[PDB]
Amino acid sequence: TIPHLAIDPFSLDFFDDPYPDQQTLRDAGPVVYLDKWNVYGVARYAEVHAVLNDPTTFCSSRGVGLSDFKKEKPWRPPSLILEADPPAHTRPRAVLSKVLSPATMKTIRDGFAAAADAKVDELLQRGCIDAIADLAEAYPLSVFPDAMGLKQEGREHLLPYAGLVFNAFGPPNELRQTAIERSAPHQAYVNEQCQRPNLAPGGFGACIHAFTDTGEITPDEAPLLVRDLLSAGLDTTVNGIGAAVYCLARFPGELQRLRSDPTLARNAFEEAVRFESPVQTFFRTTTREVELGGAVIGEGEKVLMFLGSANRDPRRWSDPDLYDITRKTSGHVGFGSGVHMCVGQLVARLEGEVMLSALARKVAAIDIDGPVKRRFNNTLRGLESLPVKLTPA
Ligand code: HEM
Ligand SMILES: COc1ccc(C(=O)O)cc1
Ligand SMILES: [Cl-]
Ligand SMILES: [Mg+2]
Numbered sequence: 200t201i202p203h204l205a206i207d208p209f210s211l212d213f214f215d216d217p218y219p220d221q222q223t224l225r226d227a228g229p230v231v232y233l234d235k236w237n238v239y240g241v242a243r244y245a246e247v248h249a250v251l252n253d254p255t256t257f258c259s260s261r262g263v264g265l266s267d268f269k270k271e272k273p274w275r276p277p278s279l280i281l282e283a284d285p286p287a288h289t290r291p292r293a294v295l296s297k298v299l300s301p302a303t304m305k306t307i308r309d310g311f312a313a314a315a316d317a318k319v320d321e322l323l324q325r326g327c328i329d330a331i332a333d334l335a336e337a338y339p340l341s342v343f344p345d346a347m348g349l350k351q352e353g354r355e356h357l358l359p360y361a362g363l364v365f366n367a368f369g370p371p372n373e374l375r376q377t378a379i380e381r382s383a384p385h386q387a388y389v390n391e392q393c394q395r396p397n398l399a400p401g402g403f404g405a406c407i408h409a410f411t412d413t414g415e416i417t418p419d420e421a422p423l424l425v426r427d428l429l430s431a432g433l434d435t436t437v438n439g440i441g442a443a444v445y446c447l448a449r450f451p452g453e454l455q456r457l458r459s460d461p462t463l464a465r466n467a468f469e470e471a472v473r474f475e476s477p478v479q480t481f482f483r484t485t486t487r488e489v490e491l492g493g494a495v496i497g498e499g500e501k502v503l504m505f506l507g508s509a510n511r512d513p514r515r516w517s518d519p520d521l522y523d524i525t526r527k528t529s530g531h532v533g534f535g536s537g538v539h540m541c542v543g544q545l546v547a548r549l550e551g552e553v554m555l556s557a558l559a560r561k562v563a564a565i566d567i568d569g570p571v572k573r574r575f576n577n578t579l580r581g582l583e584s585l586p587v588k589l590t591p592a
Protein backbone atom coordinates (compact mmCIF):
# COMPACT_ATOMS: atom_id res chain seq x y z
CA THR A 200 0.00 0.00 0.00
CA ILE A 201 3.13 2.16 0.37
CA PRO A 202 4.66 3.50 -2.86
CA HIS A 203 8.35 2.75 -3.34
CA LEU A 204 10.30 5.56 -4.98
CA ALA A 205 13.90 5.62 -6.24
CA ILE A 206 14.35 9.40 -5.82
CA ASP A 207 17.44 10.19 -3.75
CA PRO A 208 16.57 13.39 -1.83
CA PHE A 209 20.27 13.83 -1.07
CA SER A 210 21.55 13.70 -4.66
CA LEU A 211 23.15 16.71 -6.28
CA ASP A 212 20.63 16.61 -9.14
CA PHE A 213 17.91 16.72 -6.47
CA PHE A 214 19.48 19.67 -4.64
CA ASP A 215 19.88 21.44 -7.97
CA ASP A 216 16.11 21.45 -8.55
CA PRO A 217 13.98 19.69 -5.90
CA TYR A 218 10.53 20.98 -6.76
CA PRO A 219 9.53 18.44 -9.43
CA ASP A 220 10.74 15.62 -7.19
CA GLN A 221 8.99 17.18 -4.19
CA GLN A 222 5.64 17.10 -5.97
CA THR A 223 6.27 13.48 -6.94
CA LEU A 224 6.88 12.64 -3.27
CA ARG A 225 3.71 14.50 -2.24
CA ASP A 226 1.51 13.09 -4.98
CA ALA A 227 2.77 9.53 -4.71
CA GLY A 228 0.91 9.25 -1.41
CA PRO A 229 0.83 10.54 2.18
CA VAL A 230 3.67 8.14 3.06
CA VAL A 231 6.37 6.87 0.70
CA TYR A 232 9.21 4.41 1.05
CA LEU A 233 12.56 5.59 -0.32
CA ASP A 234 14.41 2.49 -1.57
CA LYS A 235 17.65 4.43 -2.06
CA TRP A 236 18.15 4.77 1.71
CA ASN A 237 15.52 2.39 3.16
CA VAL A 238 13.50 5.08 4.94
CA TYR A 239 9.91 6.20 5.06
CA GLY A 240 9.13 9.65 3.71
CA VAL A 241 6.43 12.24 4.32
CA ALA A 242 6.32 15.39 2.20
CA ARG A 243 2.74 16.68 2.56
CA TYR A 244 1.95 19.33 5.15
CA ALA A 245 -0.57 17.36 7.22
CA GLU A 246 1.74 14.35 7.72
CA VAL A 247 4.91 16.38 8.32
CA HIS A 248 3.03 18.40 10.92
CA ALA A 249 1.55 15.29 12.55
CA VAL A 250 4.94 13.54 12.81
CA LEU A 251 6.55 16.67 14.27
CA ASN A 252 3.80 16.77 16.92
CA ASP A 253 3.83 13.08 17.92
CA PRO A 254 7.14 12.86 19.84
CA THR A 255 6.40 9.73 21.90
CA THR A 256 6.10 7.67 18.69
CA PHE A 257 8.44 9.57 16.32
CA CYS A 258 11.36 10.25 18.65
CA SER A 259 14.54 12.32 18.33
CA SER A 260 16.80 10.46 20.81
CA ARG A 261 17.83 7.89 18.20
CA GLY A 262 19.08 10.77 16.02
CA VAL A 263 17.42 13.22 13.62
CA GLY A 264 19.69 12.23 10.76
CA LEU A 265 19.62 8.98 8.80
CA SER A 266 21.93 7.26 11.29
CA ASP A 267 20.16 5.36 14.08
CA PHE A 268 22.08 6.02 17.29
CA LYS A 269 20.91 2.62 18.60
CA LYS A 270 22.79 0.97 15.70
CA GLU A 271 25.84 3.18 14.99
CA LYS A 272 27.92 5.54 17.09
CA PRO A 273 27.08 9.22 16.45
CA TRP A 274 29.96 11.20 14.93
CA ARG A 275 30.01 13.46 18.03
CA PRO A 276 28.38 13.21 21.47
CA PRO A 277 24.62 13.66 21.00
CA SER A 278 22.99 17.00 21.63
CA LEU A 279 21.14 17.12 24.96
CA ILE A 280 18.32 19.00 23.17
CA LEU A 281 18.08 18.33 19.42
CA GLU A 282 18.83 14.60 19.84
CA ALA A 283 16.89 14.08 23.08
CA ASP A 284 13.32 13.21 24.03
CA PRO A 285 11.18 14.48 26.93
CA PRO A 286 11.59 14.32 29.87
CA ALA A 287 15.39 14.55 29.40
CA HIS A 288 14.85 17.22 26.73
CA THR A 289 12.82 19.59 28.88
CA ARG A 290 15.15 21.29 31.34
CA PRO A 291 18.07 21.92 28.91
CA ARG A 292 15.52 23.20 26.35
CA ALA A 293 14.27 25.63 29.00
CA VAL A 294 17.81 26.99 29.54
CA LEU A 295 18.23 27.74 25.85
CA SER A 296 14.68 29.13 25.81
CA LYS A 297 15.65 31.58 28.55
CA VAL A 298 19.12 32.41 27.18
CA LEU A 299 17.64 33.27 23.75
CA SER A 300 14.49 34.74 25.32
CA PRO A 301 12.40 37.79 24.46
CA ALA A 302 14.12 39.78 27.22
CA THR A 303 17.53 38.88 25.74
CA MET A 304 16.52 40.21 22.33
CA LYS A 305 16.13 43.64 23.91
CA THR A 306 19.83 43.58 24.91
CA ILE A 307 21.08 42.84 21.36
CA ARG A 308 18.55 44.53 19.07
CA ASP A 309 20.25 47.92 18.77
CA GLY A 310 23.65 46.38 17.97
CA PHE A 311 22.21 43.87 15.49
CA ALA A 312 20.16 46.54 13.69
CA ALA A 313 23.09 48.98 13.70
CA ALA A 314 25.30 46.32 12.15
CA ALA A 315 22.63 45.58 9.50
CA ASP A 316 22.23 49.25 8.50
CA ALA A 317 26.00 49.71 8.38
CA LYS A 318 26.50 46.64 6.15
CA VAL A 319 23.88 47.64 3.57
CA ASP A 320 25.36 51.15 3.49
CA GLU A 321 28.80 49.61 3.01
CA LEU A 322 27.57 47.39 0.19
CA LEU A 323 25.90 50.36 -1.52
CA GLN A 324 29.33 52.01 -1.75
CA ARG A 325 30.59 49.01 -3.73
CA GLY A 326 27.70 48.43 -6.15
CA CYS A 327 28.93 45.02 -7.42
CA ILE A 328 28.56 42.60 -4.49
CA ASP A 329 28.10 38.90 -3.75
CA ALA A 330 25.01 38.63 -1.55
CA ILE A 331 26.33 35.40 -0.01
CA ALA A 332 29.95 36.21 0.82
CA ASP A 333 29.44 39.95 1.34
CA LEU A 334 26.02 39.89 2.98
CA ALA A 335 24.40 36.58 3.95
CA GLU A 336 27.66 35.42 5.52
CA ALA A 337 29.26 38.77 6.33
CA TYR A 338 26.44 40.18 8.47
CA PRO A 339 25.89 37.12 10.74
CA LEU A 340 29.65 36.74 11.14
CA SER A 341 29.68 40.35 12.29
CA VAL A 342 26.95 39.98 14.96
CA PHE A 343 26.54 36.37 16.09
CA PRO A 344 30.05 35.27 17.20
CA ASP A 345 30.26 38.43 19.31
CA ALA A 346 26.80 37.81 20.78
CA MET A 347 27.98 34.28 21.64
CA GLY A 348 30.91 35.95 23.38
CA LEU A 349 33.49 34.06 21.31
CA LYS A 350 37.10 35.18 21.16
CA GLN A 351 38.50 36.36 17.83
CA GLU A 352 41.00 33.53 17.31
CA GLY A 353 39.67 30.57 15.38
CA ARG A 354 36.37 32.00 14.10
CA GLU A 355 37.36 30.75 10.62
CA HIS A 356 36.25 27.29 11.86
CA LEU A 357 32.63 28.26 12.57
CA LEU A 358 31.09 27.88 9.13
CA PRO A 359 33.17 24.77 8.26
CA TYR A 360 31.94 23.15 11.49
CA ALA A 361 28.32 24.04 10.71
CA GLY A 362 28.59 22.64 7.18
CA LEU A 363 29.83 19.43 8.79
CA VAL A 364 26.94 19.34 11.28
CA PHE A 365 24.29 19.76 8.60
CA ASN A 366 25.95 17.37 6.12
CA ALA A 367 26.22 14.78 8.93
CA PHE A 368 22.42 14.54 9.29
CA GLY A 369 22.39 13.08 5.79
CA PRO A 370 23.09 9.61 4.48
CA PRO A 371 26.76 8.46 4.06
CA ASN A 372 27.10 9.94 0.59
CA GLU A 373 30.22 11.77 -0.56
CA LEU A 374 29.10 15.07 1.02
CA ARG A 375 28.74 13.50 4.47
CA GLN A 376 31.85 11.34 4.14
CA THR A 377 34.04 14.22 2.93
CA ALA A 378 32.73 16.51 5.69
CA ILE A 379 33.44 14.07 8.55
CA GLU A 380 36.93 12.90 7.54
CA ARG A 381 39.65 15.21 8.88
CA SER A 382 36.97 17.18 10.74
CA ALA A 383 38.99 16.88 13.97
CA PRO A 384 40.34 20.47 13.86
CA HIS A 385 36.84 21.96 13.41
CA GLN A 386 35.54 19.86 16.32
CA ALA A 387 38.53 20.74 18.50
CA TYR A 388 38.03 24.48 18.01
CA VAL A 389 34.29 24.40 18.77
CA ASN A 390 34.60 22.09 21.76
CA GLU A 391 37.30 24.32 23.26
CA GLN A 392 35.14 27.42 22.89
CA CYS A 393 32.29 25.63 24.69
CA GLN A 394 34.33 25.72 27.90
CA ARG A 395 33.38 28.50 30.35
CA PRO A 396 36.80 30.28 30.45
CA ASN A 397 36.65 31.09 26.72
CA LEU A 398 33.16 32.68 26.76
CA ALA A 399 32.90 36.42 27.34
CA PRO A 400 30.61 37.29 30.29
CA GLY A 401 27.33 38.77 29.16
CA GLY A 402 27.26 36.59 26.04
CA PHE A 403 25.10 33.63 25.09
CA GLY A 404 27.77 31.10 26.01
CA ALA A 405 28.48 32.64 29.40
CA CYS A 406 24.74 32.95 30.12
CA ILE A 407 24.31 29.23 29.43
CA HIS A 408 27.03 28.35 31.94
CA ALA A 409 25.40 30.73 34.44
CA PHE A 410 22.28 28.53 34.41
CA THR A 411 24.31 25.70 35.93
CA ASP A 412 23.71 27.51 39.25
CA THR A 413 19.94 27.00 38.94
CA GLY A 414 19.66 23.22 38.80
CA GLU A 415 18.32 23.10 35.23
CA ILE A 416 21.66 21.91 33.81
CA THR A 417 24.81 20.56 35.44
CA PRO A 418 28.20 22.19 34.75
CA ASP A 419 29.04 19.29 32.44
CA GLU A 420 25.83 19.84 30.42
CA ALA A 421 26.58 23.52 29.73
CA PRO A 422 29.34 22.99 27.10
CA LEU A 423 26.98 20.87 24.95
CA LEU A 424 24.30 23.59 25.00
CA VAL A 425 26.92 26.13 23.90
CA ARG A 426 27.73 23.58 21.17
CA ASP A 427 24.06 23.54 20.14
CA LEU A 428 24.28 27.27 19.46
CA LEU A 429 27.66 26.97 17.72
CA SER A 430 26.24 24.26 15.45
CA ALA A 431 22.91 25.84 14.48
CA GLY A 432 23.06 29.55 15.19
CA LEU A 433 25.25 30.80 12.36
CA ASP A 434 24.84 28.72 9.18
CA THR A 435 21.03 28.63 9.53
CA THR A 436 20.77 32.44 9.47
CA VAL A 437 23.27 32.72 6.61
CA ASN A 438 20.99 30.63 4.39
CA GLY A 439 17.92 32.31 5.91
CA ILE A 440 19.18 35.75 4.91
CA GLY A 441 20.66 34.44 1.67
CA ALA A 442 17.22 33.09 0.72
CA ALA A 443 15.56 36.40 1.59
CA VAL A 444 17.88 38.35 -0.71
CA TYR A 445 17.40 35.73 -3.44
CA CYS A 446 13.63 36.03 -3.08
CA LEU A 447 13.75 39.82 -3.24
CA ALA A 448 16.14 39.66 -6.19
CA ARG A 449 13.65 37.43 -8.07
CA PHE A 450 10.38 39.14 -7.02
CA PRO A 451 10.88 42.87 -7.70
CA GLY A 452 7.21 43.54 -6.93
CA GLU A 453 7.76 42.21 -3.40
CA LEU A 454 10.93 44.24 -2.88
CA GLN A 455 8.89 47.29 -3.87
CA ARG A 456 6.10 46.33 -1.46
CA LEU A 457 8.73 45.95 1.28
CA ARG A 458 10.27 49.32 0.31
CA SER A 459 6.91 51.02 0.74
CA ASP A 460 6.30 49.49 4.21
CA PRO A 461 9.53 48.46 6.00
CA THR A 462 7.43 47.06 8.83
CA LEU A 463 6.71 44.08 6.54
CA ALA A 464 10.41 43.17 7.02
CA ARG A 465 9.74 40.57 9.70
CA ASN A 466 7.07 38.75 7.67
CA ALA A 467 9.18 39.19 4.53
CA PHE A 468 11.78 37.10 6.35
CA GLU A 469 9.25 34.55 7.62
CA GLU A 470 7.90 34.09 4.08
CA ALA A 471 11.47 33.58 2.86
CA VAL A 472 11.83 30.78 5.45
CA ARG A 473 8.63 29.14 4.22
CA PHE A 474 9.47 29.69 0.54
CA GLU A 475 13.10 28.47 0.41
CA SER A 476 13.12 26.46 3.67
CA PRO A 477 16.87 26.76 4.39
CA VAL A 478 16.54 23.67 6.61
CA GLN A 479 15.04 21.16 4.19
CA THR A 480 14.76 17.93 6.16
CA PHE A 481 15.01 16.21 9.51
CA PHE A 482 14.52 12.57 10.49
CA ARG A 483 12.53 10.90 13.23
CA THR A 484 12.78 7.27 14.41
CA THR A 485 9.66 5.28 15.31
CA THR A 486 9.56 3.88 18.86
CA ARG A 487 6.66 1.53 18.15
CA GLU A 488 4.59 0.13 15.32
CA VAL A 489 2.37 2.96 14.08
CA GLU A 490 -0.14 3.64 11.32
CA LEU A 491 0.78 6.86 9.51
CA GLY A 492 -1.35 7.99 6.57
CA GLY A 493 -2.85 4.52 6.26
CA ALA A 494 0.49 2.70 6.28
CA VAL A 495 1.93 0.39 8.95
CA ILE A 496 5.54 1.23 9.79
CA GLY A 497 7.41 -0.92 12.25
CA GLU A 498 9.41 -0.02 15.31
CA GLY A 499 12.90 1.34 14.82
CA GLU A 500 12.35 2.85 11.35
CA LYS A 501 13.72 6.15 10.07
CA VAL A 502 11.13 8.65 8.83
CA LEU A 503 12.35 11.51 6.64
CA MET A 504 10.39 14.77 6.96
CA PHE A 505 10.46 17.09 3.91
CA LEU A 506 9.97 20.44 5.62
CA GLY A 507 10.52 22.36 2.38
CA SER A 508 7.91 20.29 0.54
CA ALA A 509 5.51 20.64 3.46
CA ASN A 510 5.90 24.43 3.14
CA ARG A 511 4.99 24.25 -0.56
CA ASP A 512 2.10 21.78 -0.35
CA PRO A 513 -0.85 23.13 -2.42
CA ARG A 514 -3.15 21.19 -0.08
CA ARG A 515 -2.21 23.79 2.54
CA TRP A 516 -0.82 26.88 0.77
CA SER A 517 -2.52 28.89 -1.94
CA ASP A 518 0.01 29.82 -4.64
CA PRO A 519 2.77 27.99 -2.72
CA ASP A 520 5.48 28.78 -5.29
CA LEU A 521 4.85 32.52 -4.99
CA TYR A 522 6.86 34.68 -2.60
CA ASP A 523 4.23 36.82 -0.80
CA ILE A 524 5.39 39.06 2.05
CA THR A 525 1.84 39.55 3.35
CA ARG A 526 1.10 35.81 3.44
CA LYS A 527 -0.32 34.48 6.70
CA THR A 528 2.83 32.44 7.33
CA SER A 529 1.97 30.91 10.73
CA GLY A 530 1.97 27.12 10.72
CA HIS A 531 4.88 26.76 8.32
CA VAL A 532 7.37 24.15 9.47
CA GLY A 533 10.59 25.91 8.45
CA PHE A 534 11.39 26.26 12.17
CA GLY A 535 9.91 22.88 13.04
CA SER A 536 6.79 22.45 15.17
CA GLY A 537 5.97 20.99 18.55
CA VAL A 538 8.40 20.26 21.35
CA HIS A 539 11.59 20.78 19.29
CA MET A 540 10.48 23.95 17.48
CA CYS A 541 13.53 26.14 16.86
CA VAL A 542 14.67 27.56 20.18
CA GLY A 543 16.77 30.11 18.25
CA GLN A 544 13.89 31.50 16.17
CA LEU A 545 14.00 34.87 17.97
CA VAL A 546 17.67 35.38 17.06
CA ALA A 547 17.06 34.24 13.48
CA ARG A 548 14.02 36.50 13.05
CA LEU A 549 15.86 39.45 14.61
CA GLU A 550 18.79 39.07 12.20
CA GLY A 551 16.34 38.61 9.35
CA GLU A 552 14.05 41.49 10.31
CA VAL A 553 16.77 44.13 10.72
CA MET A 554 18.76 43.29 7.59
CA LEU A 555 15.54 43.28 5.53
CA SER A 556 14.57 46.53 7.25
CA ALA A 557 17.92 47.96 6.17
CA LEU A 558 17.32 46.78 2.60
CA ALA A 559 13.79 48.17 2.58
CA ARG A 560 14.91 51.64 3.68
CA LYS A 561 18.14 51.89 1.67
CA VAL A 562 17.91 49.87 -1.56
CA ALA A 563 15.74 50.54 -4.62
CA ALA A 564 16.54 47.51 -6.75
CA ILE A 565 18.43 44.23 -6.47
CA ASP A 566 19.43 42.78 -9.85
CA ILE A 567 21.26 39.49 -10.34
CA ASP A 568 24.39 40.57 -12.21
CA GLY A 569 26.60 37.48 -12.38
CA PRO A 570 26.62 33.67 -12.39
CA VAL A 571 24.50 32.17 -9.61
CA LYS A 572 26.10 29.13 -7.98
CA ARG A 573 24.27 26.74 -5.67
CA ARG A 574 25.79 25.38 -2.44
CA PHE A 575 25.11 21.69 -1.88
CA ASN A 576 24.55 20.32 1.64
CA ASN A 577 22.61 17.27 2.82
CA THR A 578 20.28 19.36 4.99
CA LEU A 579 20.68 23.06 4.06
CA ARG A 580 19.37 24.75 0.92
CA GLY A 581 21.17 27.89 -0.13
CA LEU A 582 23.55 29.52 -2.55
CA GLU A 583 27.33 29.65 -2.72
CA SER A 584 27.50 32.87 -4.74
CA LEU A 585 24.80 35.43 -5.65
CA PRO A 586 26.29 38.33 -7.62
CA VAL A 587 23.81 41.20 -7.50
CA LYS A 588 23.63 44.89 -8.30
CA LEU A 589 22.44 47.12 -5.47
CA THR A 590 20.73 50.32 -6.62
CA PRO A 591 20.49 52.97 -3.86
CA ALA A 592 17.07 54.37 -3.03
C1 HEM B 1 16.38 30.87 9.62
C2 HEM B 1 17.12 30.28 10.57
C3 HEM B 1 16.80 28.90 11.21
C4 HEM B 1 16.07 27.87 10.76
C5 HEM B 1 15.37 27.76 9.38
C6 HEM B 1 16.07 26.84 11.79
C7 HEM B 1 15.45 25.61 11.74
C8 HEM B 1 15.24 24.73 12.79
C9 HEM B 1 14.41 23.54 12.78
C10 HEM B 1 13.58 23.05 11.56
C11 HEM B 1 14.48 22.95 13.98
C12 HEM B 1 13.71 21.68 14.39
C13 HEM B 1 14.59 20.46 14.63
C14 HEM B 1 13.76 19.22 14.84
O1 HEM B 1 12.51 19.31 14.98
O2 HEM B 1 14.33 18.10 14.89
C15 HEM B 1 15.36 23.76 14.82
C16 HEM B 1 15.74 23.53 16.14
C17 HEM B 1 16.80 24.15 16.78
N1 HEM B 1 17.43 25.30 16.36
FE1 HEM B 1 16.81 26.47 14.78
N2 HEM B 1 16.79 27.32 12.87
C18 HEM B 1 17.25 28.58 12.55
C19 HEM B 1 18.02 29.41 13.35
C20 HEM B 1 18.57 29.04 14.55
C21 HEM B 1 19.34 29.88 15.44
C22 HEM B 1 19.66 31.37 15.16
C23 HEM B 1 19.69 29.12 16.50
C24 HEM B 1 20.51 29.53 17.76
C25 HEM B 1 20.90 30.78 18.04
C26 HEM B 1 19.14 27.79 16.31
C27 HEM B 1 19.28 26.71 17.16
C28 HEM B 1 18.44 25.61 17.26
C29 HEM B 1 18.43 24.59 18.30
C30 HEM B 1 19.39 24.50 19.53
C31 HEM B 1 17.45 23.72 18.00
C32 HEM B 1 17.02 22.47 18.78
C33 HEM B 1 15.76 22.86 19.56
C34 HEM B 1 15.09 21.65 20.17
O3 HEM B 1 15.42 20.47 19.78
O4 HEM B 1 14.24 21.89 21.06
N3 HEM B 1 18.47 27.78 15.11
N4 HEM B 1 15.80 24.82 14.06
C1 LIG C 1 18.29 23.30 12.94
O1 LIG C 1 19.45 22.54 12.83
C2 LIG C 1 20.07 22.23 14.04
C3 LIG C 1 21.34 21.67 13.98
C4 LIG C 1 22.00 21.35 15.15
C5 LIG C 1 21.38 21.56 16.36
C6 LIG C 1 22.15 21.20 17.63
O2 LIG C 1 23.36 20.88 17.55
O3 LIG C 1 21.57 21.24 18.74
C7 LIG C 1 20.10 22.12 16.42
C8 LIG C 1 19.44 22.45 15.25
CL1 LIG D 1 32.28 19.00 18.16
MG1 LIG E 1 34.80 12.31 19.01
